[PDB]
Amino acid sequence: RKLRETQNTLNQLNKQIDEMNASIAKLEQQKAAQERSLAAQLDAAFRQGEHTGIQLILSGEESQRGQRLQAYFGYLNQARQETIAQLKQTREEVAMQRAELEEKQSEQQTL
Amino acid sequence: NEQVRYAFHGALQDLKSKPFATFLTVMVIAISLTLPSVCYMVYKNVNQAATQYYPSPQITVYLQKTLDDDAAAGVVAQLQAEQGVEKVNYLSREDALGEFRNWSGFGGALDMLEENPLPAVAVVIPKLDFQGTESLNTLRDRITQINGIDEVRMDDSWFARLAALTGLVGRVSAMIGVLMVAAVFLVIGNSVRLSIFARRDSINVQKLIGATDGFILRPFLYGGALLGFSGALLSLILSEILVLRLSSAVAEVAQVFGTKFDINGLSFDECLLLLLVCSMIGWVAAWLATVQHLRHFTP
Amino acid sequence: NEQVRYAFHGALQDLKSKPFATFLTVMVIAISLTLPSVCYMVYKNVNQAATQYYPSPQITVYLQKTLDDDAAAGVVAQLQAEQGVEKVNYLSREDALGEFRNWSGFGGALDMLEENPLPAVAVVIPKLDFQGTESLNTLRDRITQINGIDEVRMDDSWFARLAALTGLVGRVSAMIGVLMVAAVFLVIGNSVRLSIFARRDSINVQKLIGATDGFILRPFLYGGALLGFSGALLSLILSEILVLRLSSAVAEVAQVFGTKFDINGLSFDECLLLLLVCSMIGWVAAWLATVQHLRHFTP
Amino acid sequence: MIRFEHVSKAYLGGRQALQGVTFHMQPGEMAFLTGHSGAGKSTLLKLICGIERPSAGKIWFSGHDITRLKNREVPFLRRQIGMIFQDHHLLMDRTVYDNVAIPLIIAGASGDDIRRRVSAALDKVGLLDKAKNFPIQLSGGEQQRVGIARAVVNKPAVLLADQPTGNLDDALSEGILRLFEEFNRVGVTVLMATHDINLISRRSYRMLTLSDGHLHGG
Amino acid sequence: MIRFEHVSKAYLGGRQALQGVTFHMQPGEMAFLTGHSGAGKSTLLKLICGIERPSAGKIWFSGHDITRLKNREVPFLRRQIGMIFQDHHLLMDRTVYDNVAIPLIIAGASGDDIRRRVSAALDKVGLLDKAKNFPIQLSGGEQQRVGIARAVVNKPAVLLADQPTGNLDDALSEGILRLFEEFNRVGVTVLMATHDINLISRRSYRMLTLSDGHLHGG
Ligand SMILES: Nc1ncnc2c1ncn2[C@@H]1O[C@H](COP(=O)(O)OP(=O)(O)OP(=O)(O)O)[C@@H](O)[C@H]1O
Ligand SMILES: Nc1ncnc2c1ncn2[C@@H]1O[C@H](COP(=O)(O)OP(=O)(O)OP(=O)(O)O)[C@@H](O)[C@H]1O
């Protein structure tokens, strides 16, 4: 009976390892590649982007006003804020899933 | 009508009598007059001439994820072609993807941040329907009331940047033009008045032999109109030397900056008007001066 | 000593003999002189505003991961401090971390997104030789593709557009200024010459006894300076009244579309220069006009 | 056709040039106006001609009062008389042919008639040789004679001469006086102000003396 | 001091004013110059002054040849001479005090002396009451005497009068001649061009006659 409980706990630990691998994929690939992307959305003001662009535009603005309103500058920042909210939610969910996986692994290990 | 011929002959002889005095008077009238006729190139050419639209709010509603190829016509069937709108600038999905990449916004995040959720939308050209300020304004939100388009980045544009030209510029240049079109009158009148003052002696002499009030006047009027007319004609001979010379500089900056502004010259419909106006100014100045100096010799 | 007083008194006497003629001449001179003064005011104020706006950009080569403290020292020894460079703006690492945080872009992602990969910005203002875009051209790419930093944030040719605008507000305003100075030159010269021609009847002084040419000249020179000087004095009063009218409207528009860049007037040195130049021109014209007469009244 | 009824003329400033002058001249009558220097002779001639205005009294010319004449009717009074001034009042930028011909042009005559009449009037004084010269290229007597030729060229109704024989010698002065007399034999009233005693002593004409603005001569 | 040696003058245009004039005039020698109109008298006086240049012959003034005088030395020669023209050549916009006083201003004299000498010279010809009037407010004789007063003010060495009596009556003519004689009794060389006969007949002076530019007297 203890061995069947241990086998259930080992299956739970294998499921927790699979969930940790899924968390690796989702959140850690978020971190690495999609936070290269996120810090590039922020680099649109920090690294090779913006630098607080307030310079006056010339005649016949090819976007460059619609840009900063909602296009490759303004909607860039808007989607960056949306993705930053999404990434804050993803980081909170990563913390929650890490807590859940740790609780599952602690139940498995205590058992 | 031999009186007209005799008066014209006398005026011509009086002008030809002092070639250096006549030429130096025509020279100042022509130079003092080419400034209005060369600064009118600027306000006729370039400004006004190359009038390229203005900061008009083509900005429009921002469509949600429900926007597609079919929804583009549906939005047109509601606001982008049924309400006030002239042109279609629906850059939905991939259309504003590579263009967004080659703009000031650098790309490369799209391959990393899954897919770019470029908030859909479609710049419009509010036709008469919504063109009107109020036609838009209130019905601008009504335009938003069409298909989907979650948001409506519709904007205004122009702002005060459209005041540091309708204000500062709209008064200074007019003031300068008024100054020049007073200077030309003043210089022509002064020249003619001094010409009559030089020969007042003959006025007195032929007044006290009899004569009439009108007989004494004609050689001075015809010699005051011929001074304005001949000084304006040389300003048209000039002011084309300068404009053609300036054409080279404007042509060079055409390609460096963008659209090629085309320069031109003064037209006949304004050349004739300029000649007539200068003739009238000279005539009236001669009349004023002679009548002033004809009541002096009446004891 | 006494001859100076006698000549000045005679000059004032013949100036006040005909008040309307001298007043009209002075008005013509002042009107013809208030145009270049206003043009120079607007040119100087625009030049000052343009200089205050932006002298040069701070766009540099974007650094790759190879940038460090030692790599920044190398980039200084290569381009950032040894090649064309005025100052140093190496904001590598934490320097461009809080600055990016307090920039337009919202921060706070550092606590979540591990470590912020802020670039090593190495901004430097190139010297005058390298300031030119044509000088930059290939060398700008060569400077960018020299060593260290990988990418290159190139300029948008805003400096080139400012240079072309300055070249226009150069060549064109230079031609306008030379035209205006020629106009005032001829106005003063012609007025003095015609006044001397009217009062030419003083062959008597030359014929009567040994009134040497020096004696005859002095009443006419001092009466030529008094005419140019009074034209310049009335222009300064007239020029400054005019700009005060076109200042309150102009200053308000500047505040709305940016900052209230008002219009200044002339320094004391500029006014003194104008008065001195006008008096000098009048003196020269009087000398020429009188010497013209002193030769045809001789045997 | 000249009547002065208690005429007086004081210039601006306080110099009473003429005081209580009364006299009468009939159609077709010669007379000499004599006086000392500064007496009032040219002032009297100016009043007759129309240049100056009296301060009191009446002037009648050709039977029509002219003591108060409109500025529109003056050129039709000054056109009936031939005046010979003392400055010779020439147009120095025209030829002498143009100077002599300008009265006919003012009155509106034809071209060949102008040429013939100007040539006749220039011959009468001896200046036909000099019809192409400007008045700068003439002596003083020749400019005087140009003025005299200008005066008589239009067959006037009155001749008003103001020392017309100065700068002329005695032979030429007698010739000019003979020309005036031959014009007066037709019915032209002459009035000639003179400083010559020899010239008037050899003829019997009415003589108005004038002593400090007081006629007491006729 | 004056001397002409075969002097001739042909004005540009083809009019021989003078031909073959030769004469000599010692210091302090009065003389008259007579002739018909157009003889060439004012031309002789102009050659002496320096206004015109001889086409031939030689002119000597005070022992210095002036036939080829420069343009920087004409002033001193014209200062040594007191000349009265036929036009009176006087500035029309200055008081007669200024007209009479300009030679003293040119000479460089003080203020009190200028006032004293101008008053004396204006009184000699009888114009002191009119020291403030403009020349327009004078008559022909009064303007003539303004010219005479300006001439005699600087105590010249040669006095060249060009018909200084025409426009003046007989008593004034005698007064003017007596003034020139009181100047000549000191040693001033007077040459007086005139063609009135009652003046040069009652006084025995050398008389040079001209007839179409040829000196018939000497
Ligand atoms: N324009 C004038 N304004 C004021 N007074 C004048 C004017 N012209 C002349 N007089 C004065 O009026 C008086 C008479 O002058 P008027 O010209 O009649 O003299 P006149 O007889 O011509 O003299 P003369 O014989 O010398 O030519 C004089 O006192 C003279 O100075
Ligand atoms: N500026 C001149 N140019 C050409 N010829 C002239 C000029 N002045 C005078 N003449 C001519 O020269 C000759 C002499 O003139 P001038 O004036 O010397 O004579 P005049 O004896 O003074 O005359 P009058 O006795 O009439 O005053 C005349 O033929 C005259 O027309």
Side-chain angles (χ1 to χ4, degrees), chain D residues 86-109:
Chain D
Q86 216 183 7
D87 313 278
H88 316 151
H89 269 117
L90 295 184
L91 308 165
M92 293 298 257
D93 40 49
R94 265 80 135 192
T95 313
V96 313
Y97 177 97
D98 303 60
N99 281 294
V100 174
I102 197 181
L104 313 161
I105 283 169
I106 283 170

PDB file of all heavy atoms in Angstrom, chain D residues 86-109:
ATOM      1  N   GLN D  86      12.097 143.855 -68.426  1.00  0.00           N
ATOM      2  CA  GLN D  86      13.433 144.365 -68.166  1.00  0.00           C
ATOM      3  C   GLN D  86      14.459 143.264 -67.949  1.00  0.00           C
ATOM      4  O   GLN D  86      15.657 143.520 -68.102  1.00  0.00           O
ATOM      5  CB  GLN D  86      13.411 145.289 -66.943  1.00  0.00           C
ATOM      6  CG  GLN D  86      14.350 146.466 -67.040  1.00  0.00           C
ATOM      7  CD  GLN D  86      14.351 147.302 -65.792  1.00  0.00           C
ATOM      8  OE1 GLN D  86      13.739 146.942 -64.796  1.00  0.00           O
ATOM      9  NE2 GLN D  86      15.048 148.422 -65.832  1.00  0.00           N
ATOM     10  N   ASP D  87      14.027 142.060 -67.587  1.00  0.00           N
ATOM     11  CA  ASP D  87      14.915 140.913 -67.487  1.00  0.00           C
ATOM     12  C   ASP D  87      15.014 140.136 -68.789  1.00  0.00           C
ATOM     13  O   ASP D  87      15.820 139.206 -68.876  1.00  0.00           O
ATOM     14  CB  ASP D  87      14.433 139.970 -66.386  1.00  0.00           C
ATOM     15  CG  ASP D  87      14.093 140.694 -65.110  1.00  0.00           C
ATOM     16  OD1 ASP D  87      15.018 140.989 -64.326  1.00  0.00           O
ATOM     17  OD2 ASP D  87      12.895 140.960 -64.885  1.00  0.00           O
ATOM     18  N   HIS D  88      14.195 140.493 -69.778  1.00  0.00           N
ATOM     19  CA  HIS D  88      14.077 139.882 -71.099  1.00  0.00           C
ATOM     20  C   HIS D  88      13.368 138.535 -71.052  1.00  0.00           C
ATOM     21  O   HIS D  88      12.959 138.031 -72.100  1.00  0.00           O
ATOM     22  CB  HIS D  88      15.446 139.705 -71.767  1.00  0.00           C
ATOM     23  CG  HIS D  88      16.354 140.887 -71.635  1.00  0.00           C
ATOM     24  ND1 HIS D  88      17.728 140.765 -71.614  1.00  0.00           N
ATOM     25  CD2 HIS D  88      16.093 142.210 -71.530  1.00  0.00           C
ATOM     26  CE1 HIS D  88      18.271 141.963 -71.498  1.00  0.00           C
ATOM     27  NE2 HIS D  88      17.302 142.856 -71.442  1.00  0.00           N
ATOM     28  N   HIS D  89      13.196 137.973 -69.859  1.00  0.00           N
ATOM     29  CA  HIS D  89      12.307 136.841 -69.579  1.00  0.00           C
ATOM     30  C   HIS D  89      12.226 135.841 -70.734  1.00  0.00           C
ATOM     31  O   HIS D  89      11.158 135.574 -71.283  1.00  0.00           O
ATOM     32  CB  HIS D  89      10.922 137.345 -69.208  1.00  0.00           C
ATOM     33  CG  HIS D  89      10.733 137.564 -67.743  1.00  0.00           C
ATOM     34  ND1 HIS D  89      10.478 138.805 -67.204  1.00  0.00           N
ATOM     35  CD2 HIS D  89      10.745 136.700 -66.704  1.00  0.00           C
ATOM     36  CE1 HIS D  89      10.353 138.698 -65.895  1.00  0.00           C
ATOM     37  NE2 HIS D  89      10.507 137.429 -65.566  1.00  0.00           N
ATOM     38  N   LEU D  90      13.376 135.292 -71.107  1.00  0.00           N
ATOM     39  CA  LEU D  90      13.464 134.349 -72.212  1.00  0.00           C
ATOM     40  C   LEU D  90      13.445 132.911 -71.705  1.00  0.00           C
ATOM     41  O   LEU D  90      13.749 132.635 -70.544  1.00  0.00           O
ATOM     42  CB  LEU D  90      14.737 134.583 -73.029  1.00  0.00           C
ATOM     43  CG  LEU D  90      14.936 135.890 -73.797  1.00  0.00           C
ATOM     44  CD1 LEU D  90      16.218 135.828 -74.579  1.00  0.00           C
ATOM     45  CD2 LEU D  90      13.783 136.167 -74.719  1.00  0.00           C
ATOM     46  N   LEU D  91      13.084 131.989 -72.597  1.00  0.00           N
ATOM     47  CA  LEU D  91      13.221 130.556 -72.338  1.00  0.00           C
ATOM     48  C   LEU D  91      14.604 130.147 -72.823  1.00  0.00           C
ATOM     49  O   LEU D  91      14.840 130.023 -74.024  1.00  0.00           O
ATOM     50  CB  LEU D  91      12.133 129.753 -73.042  1.00  0.00           C
ATOM     51  CG  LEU D  91      10.666 130.132 -72.868  1.00  0.00           C
ATOM     52  CD1 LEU D  91       9.837 129.444 -73.923  1.00  0.00           C
ATOM     53  CD2 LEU D  91      10.172 129.766 -71.496  1.00  0.00           C
ATOM     54  N   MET D  92      15.527 129.934 -71.890  1.00  0.00           N
ATOM     55  CA  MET D  92      16.928 129.780 -72.255  1.00  0.00           C
ATOM     56  C   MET D  92      17.256 128.417 -72.843  1.00  0.00           C
ATOM     57  O   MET D  92      18.364 128.236 -73.354  1.00  0.00           O
ATOM     58  CB  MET D  92      17.817 130.042 -71.040  1.00  0.00           C
ATOM     59  CG  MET D  92      17.787 131.479 -70.561  1.00  0.00           C
ATOM     60  SD  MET D  92      18.390 132.637 -71.797  1.00  0.00           S
ATOM     61  CE  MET D  92      20.029 132.969 -71.173  1.00  0.00           C
ATOM     62  N   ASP D  93      16.334 127.460 -72.787  1.00  0.00           N
ATOM     63  CA  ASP D  93      16.561 126.131 -73.332  1.00  0.00           C
ATOM     64  C   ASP D  93      15.952 125.933 -74.715  1.00  0.00           C
ATOM     65  O   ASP D  93      16.143 124.870 -75.309  1.00  0.00           O
ATOM     66  CB  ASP D  93      16.024 125.073 -72.367  1.00  0.00           C
ATOM     67  CG  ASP D  93      14.708 125.475 -71.739  1.00  0.00           C
ATOM     68  OD1 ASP D  93      13.796 125.885 -72.477  1.00  0.00           O
ATOM     69  OD2 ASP D  93      14.582 125.380 -70.502  1.00  0.00           O
ATOM     70  N   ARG D  94      15.237 126.921 -75.241  1.00  0.00           N
ATOM     71  CA  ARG D  94      14.685 126.874 -76.585  1.00  0.00           C
ATOM     72  C   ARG D  94      15.523 127.727 -77.527  1.00  0.00           C
ATOM     73  O   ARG D  94      16.420 128.453 -77.110  1.00  0.00           O
ATOM     74  CB  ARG D  94      13.235 127.349 -76.588  1.00  0.00           C
ATOM     75  CG  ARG D  94      12.220 126.241 -76.501  1.00  0.00           C
ATOM     76  CD  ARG D  94      12.058 125.755 -75.083  1.00  0.00           C
ATOM     77  NE  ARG D  94      10.654 125.593 -74.725  1.00  0.00           N
ATOM     78  CZ  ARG D  94      10.213 125.403 -73.490  1.00  0.00           C
ATOM     79  NH1 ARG D  94      11.044 125.329 -72.464  1.00  0.00           N
ATOM     80  NH2 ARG D  94       8.905 125.288 -73.278  1.00  0.00           N
ATOM     81  N   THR D  95      15.228 127.624 -78.818  1.00  0.00           N
ATOM     82  CA  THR D  95      15.889 128.444 -79.818  1.00  0.00           C
ATOM     83  C   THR D  95      15.251 129.833 -79.800  1.00  0.00           C
ATOM     84  O   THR D  95      14.277 130.074 -79.084  1.00  0.00           O
ATOM     85  CB  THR D  95      15.790 127.767 -81.182  1.00  0.00           C
ATOM     86  OG1 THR D  95      16.151 126.389 -81.050  1.00  0.00           O
ATOM     87  CG2 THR D  95      16.750 128.379 -82.165  1.00  0.00           C
ATOM     88  N   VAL D  96      15.791 130.786 -80.564  1.00  0.00           N
ATOM     89  CA  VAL D  96      15.132 132.088 -80.584  1.00  0.00           C
ATOM     90  C   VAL D  96      13.923 132.039 -81.502  1.00  0.00           C
ATOM     91  O   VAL D  96      12.969 132.799 -81.317  1.00  0.00           O
ATOM     92  CB  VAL D  96      16.083 133.220 -80.996  1.00  0.00           C
ATOM     93  CG1 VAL D  96      17.387 133.137 -80.244  1.00  0.00           C
ATOM     94  CG2 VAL D  96      16.267 133.275 -82.463  1.00  0.00           C
ATOM     95  N   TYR D  97      13.928 131.148 -82.492  1.00  0.00           N
ATOM     96  CA  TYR D  97      12.737 130.945 -83.304  1.00  0.00           C
ATOM     97  C   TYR D  97      11.585 130.442 -82.451  1.00  0.00           C
ATOM     98  O   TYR D  97      10.455 130.909 -82.592  1.00  0.00           O
ATOM     99  CB  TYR D  97      13.040 129.972 -84.441  1.00  0.00           C
ATOM    100  CG  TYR D  97      11.854 129.637 -85.311  1.00  0.00           C
ATOM    101  CD1 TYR D  97      11.636 130.298 -86.502  1.00  0.00           C
ATOM    102  CD2 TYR D  97      10.959 128.650 -84.943  1.00  0.00           C
ATOM    103  CE1 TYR D  97      10.555 129.994 -87.289  1.00  0.00           C
ATOM    104  CE2 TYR D  97       9.878 128.344 -85.721  1.00  0.00           C
ATOM    105  CZ  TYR D  97       9.681 129.015 -86.889  1.00  0.00           C
ATOM    106  OH  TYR D  97       8.598 128.693 -87.659  1.00  0.00           O
ATOM    107  N   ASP D  98      11.849 129.497 -81.550  1.00  0.00           N
ATOM    108  CA  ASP D  98      10.794 129.004 -80.669  1.00  0.00           C
ATOM    109  C   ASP D  98      10.337 130.078 -79.692  1.00  0.00           C
ATOM    110  O   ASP D  98       9.141 130.186 -79.396  1.00  0.00           O
ATOM    111  CB  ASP D  98      11.272 127.767 -79.917  1.00  0.00           C
ATOM    112  CG  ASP D  98      11.737 126.659 -80.845  1.00  0.00           C
ATOM    113  OD1 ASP D  98      12.686 126.889 -81.622  1.00  0.00           O
ATOM    114  OD2 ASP D  98      11.159 125.554 -80.795  1.00  0.00           O
ATOM    115  N   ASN D  99      11.274 130.885 -79.188  1.00  0.00           N
ATOM    116  CA  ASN D  99      10.920 131.966 -78.273  1.00  0.00           C
ATOM    117  C   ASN D  99       9.993 132.971 -78.941  1.00  0.00           C
ATOM    118  O   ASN D  99       8.994 133.391 -78.354  1.00  0.00           O
ATOM    119  CB  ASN D  99      12.182 132.662 -77.779  1.00  0.00           C
ATOM    120  CG  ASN D  99      12.882 131.896 -76.696  1.00  0.00           C
ATOM    121  OD1 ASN D  99      12.361 131.735 -75.602  1.00  0.00           O
ATOM    122  ND2 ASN D  99      14.084 131.436 -76.985  1.00  0.00           N
ATOM    123  N   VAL D 100      10.314 133.373 -80.171  1.00  0.00           N
ATOM    124  CA  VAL D 100       9.464 134.315 -80.892  1.00  0.00           C
ATOM    125  C   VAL D 100       8.159 133.661 -81.324  1.00  0.00           C
ATOM    126  O   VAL D 100       7.126 134.328 -81.412  1.00  0.00           O
ATOM    127  CB  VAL D 100      10.229 134.902 -82.089  1.00  0.00           C
ATOM    128  CG1 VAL D 100       9.334 135.751 -82.932  1.00  0.00           C
ATOM    129  CG2 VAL D 100      11.390 135.713 -81.608  1.00  0.00           C
ATOM    130  N   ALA D 101       8.168 132.358 -81.598  1.00  0.00           N
ATOM    131  CA  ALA D 101       6.987 131.695 -82.126  1.00  0.00           C
ATOM    132  C   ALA D 101       6.004 131.251 -81.063  1.00  0.00           C
ATOM    133  O   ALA D 101       4.874 130.907 -81.411  1.00  0.00           O
ATOM    134  CB  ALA D 101       7.392 130.474 -82.946  1.00  0.00           C
ATOM    135  N   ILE D 102       6.390 131.233 -79.793  1.00  0.00           N
ATOM    136  CA  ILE D 102       5.501 130.694 -78.767  1.00  0.00           C
ATOM    137  C   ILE D 102       4.205 131.492 -78.581  1.00  0.00           C
ATOM    138  O   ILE D 102       3.191 130.873 -78.231  1.00  0.00           O
ATOM    139  CB  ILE D 102       6.256 130.505 -77.438  1.00  0.00           C
ATOM    140  CG1 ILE D 102       5.483 129.569 -76.515  1.00  0.00           C
ATOM    141  CG2 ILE D 102       6.540 131.806 -76.738  1.00  0.00           C
ATOM    142  CD1 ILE D 102       6.151 129.355 -75.188  1.00  0.00           C
ATOM    143  N   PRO D 103       4.133 132.817 -78.805  1.00  0.00           N
ATOM    144  CA  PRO D 103       2.808 133.457 -78.740  1.00  0.00           C
ATOM    145  C   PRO D 103       1.842 132.975 -79.805  1.00  0.00           C
ATOM    146  O   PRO D 103       0.653 132.794 -79.524  1.00  0.00           O
ATOM    147  CB  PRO D 103       3.134 134.944 -78.905  1.00  0.00           C
ATOM    148  CG  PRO D 103       4.501 135.068 -78.471  1.00  0.00           C
ATOM    149  CD  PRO D 103       5.170 133.848 -78.970  1.00  0.00           C
ATOM    150  N   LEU D 104       2.318 132.769 -81.032  1.00  0.00           N
ATOM    151  CA  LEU D 104       1.446 132.260 -82.084  1.00  0.00           C
ATOM    152  C   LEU D 104       0.966 130.852 -81.762  1.00  0.00           C
ATOM    153  O   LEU D 104      -0.194 130.512 -82.011  1.00  0.00           O
ATOM    154  CB  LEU D 104       2.178 132.288 -83.421  1.00  0.00           C
ATOM    155  CG  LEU D 104       2.895 133.599 -83.721  1.00  0.00           C
ATOM    156  CD1 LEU D 104       3.938 133.407 -84.781  1.00  0.00           C
ATOM    157  CD2 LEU D 104       1.893 134.619 -84.161  1.00  0.00           C
ATOM    158  N   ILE D 105       1.851 130.019 -81.213  1.00  0.00           N
ATOM    159  CA  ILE D 105       1.471 128.671 -80.804  1.00  0.00           C
ATOM    160  C   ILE D 105       0.417 128.724 -79.708  1.00  0.00           C
ATOM    161  O   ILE D 105      -0.562 127.971 -79.732  1.00  0.00           O
ATOM    162  CB  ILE D 105       2.712 127.886 -80.354  1.00  0.00           C
ATOM    163  CG1 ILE D 105       3.510 127.418 -81.564  1.00  0.00           C
ATOM    164  CG2 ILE D 105       2.316 126.712 -79.507  1.00  0.00           C
ATOM    165  CD1 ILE D 105       4.867 126.869 -81.214  1.00  0.00           C
ATOM    166  N   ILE D 106       0.598 129.616 -78.732  1.00  0.00           N
ATOM    167  CA  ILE D 106      -0.389 129.770 -77.666  1.00  0.00           C
ATOM    168  C   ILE D 106      -1.741 130.167 -78.245  1.00  0.00           C
ATOM    169  O   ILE D 106      -2.783 129.628 -77.858  1.00  0.00           O
ATOM    170  CB  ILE D 106       0.099 130.800 -76.635  1.00  0.00           C
ATOM    171  CG1 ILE D 106       1.154 130.188 -75.722  1.00  0.00           C
ATOM    172  CG2 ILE D 106      -1.059 131.314 -75.837  1.00  0.00           C
ATOM    173  CD1 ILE D 106       1.853 131.187 -74.849  1.00  0.00           C
ATOM    174  N   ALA D 107      -1.745 131.114 -79.181  1.00  0.00           N
ATOM    175  CA  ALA D 107      -2.989 131.545 -79.807  1.00  0.00           C
ATOM    176  C   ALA D 107      -3.535 130.542 -80.814  1.00  0.00           C
ATOM    177  O   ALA D 107      -4.690 130.673 -81.226  1.00  0.00           O
ATOM    178  CB  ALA D 107      -2.799 132.899 -80.494  1.00  0.00           C
ATOM    179  N   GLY D 108      -2.743 129.556 -81.228  1.00  0.00           N
ATOM    180  CA  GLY D 108      -3.251 128.511 -82.093  1.00  0.00           C
ATOM    181  C   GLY D 108      -3.227 128.832 -83.571  1.00  0.00           C
ATOM    182  O   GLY D 108      -4.268 128.800 -84.231  1.00  0.00           O
ATOM    183  N   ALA D 109      -2.058 129.150 -84.109  1.00  0.00           N
ATOM    184  CA  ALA D 109      -1.925 129.430 -85.527  1.00  0.00           C
ATOM    185  C   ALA D 109      -1.375 128.203 -86.252  1.00  0.00           C
ATOM    186  O   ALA D 109      -1.004 127.203 -85.636  1.00  0.00           O
ATOM    187  CB  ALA D 109      -1.042 130.658 -85.739  1.00  0.00           C
TER     188      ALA D 109
END
